[PDB]
Amino acid sequence: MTIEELKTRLHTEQSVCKTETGIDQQKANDVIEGNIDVEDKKVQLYCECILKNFNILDKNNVFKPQGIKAVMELLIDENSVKQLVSDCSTISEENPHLKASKLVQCVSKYKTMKSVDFL
Numbered sequence: 001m002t003i004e005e006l007k008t009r010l011h012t013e014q015s016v017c018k019t020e021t022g023i024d025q026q027k028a029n030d031v032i033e034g035n036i037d038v039e040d041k042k043v044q045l046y047c048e049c050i051l052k053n054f055n056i057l058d059k060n061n062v063f064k065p066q067g068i069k070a071v072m073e074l075l076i077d078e079n080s081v082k083q084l085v086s087d088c089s090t091i092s093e094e095n096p097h098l099k100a101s102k103l104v105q106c107v108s109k110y111k112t113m114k115s116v117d118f119l
């Protein structure tokens with residue numbers, strides 16, 4: 001993968017996850033910009049859908065380091081990715097939906113999805 005292919009792939013996942021979840025564009029924009037309303041159900045589901053589609057979350061919402069590295073190593077330096085994995089893999093949340101939004105919130109501290117528009 002390259003950054004340009006990530007951009008294309010992410011746009012597609014955002015599109016399909018929007019129709020799967022019914023999230024309003026305004027709330028999708030908030031998520032993409034890194035402002036996560038972690039308790040909003042459609043935000044949770046949108047986050048979950050994108051992360052599952054990238055194999056960052058497995059079917060039972062377990063965080064997968066391989067999946068997050070495949071994406072983040074395109075965007076930030078190796079050592080920063082290591083720290084991101086160690087940080088965001090240890091989020092204190094057991095509920096799958098809330099875990100999904102909290103994971104996007106944690107990671108957004110490092111890079112937001114909107115990042116890919118600044119290629």
Ligand SMILES: c1ccc(Nc2cccc3ccccc23)cc1
Nearest residue numbers: 010054071103104107111112113
């Ligand atoms: C875990 C991994 C990534 C993200 N956010 C995002 C940051 C920037 C590019 C991305 C590409 C694919 C999926 C999420 C991306 C949130 C939680």
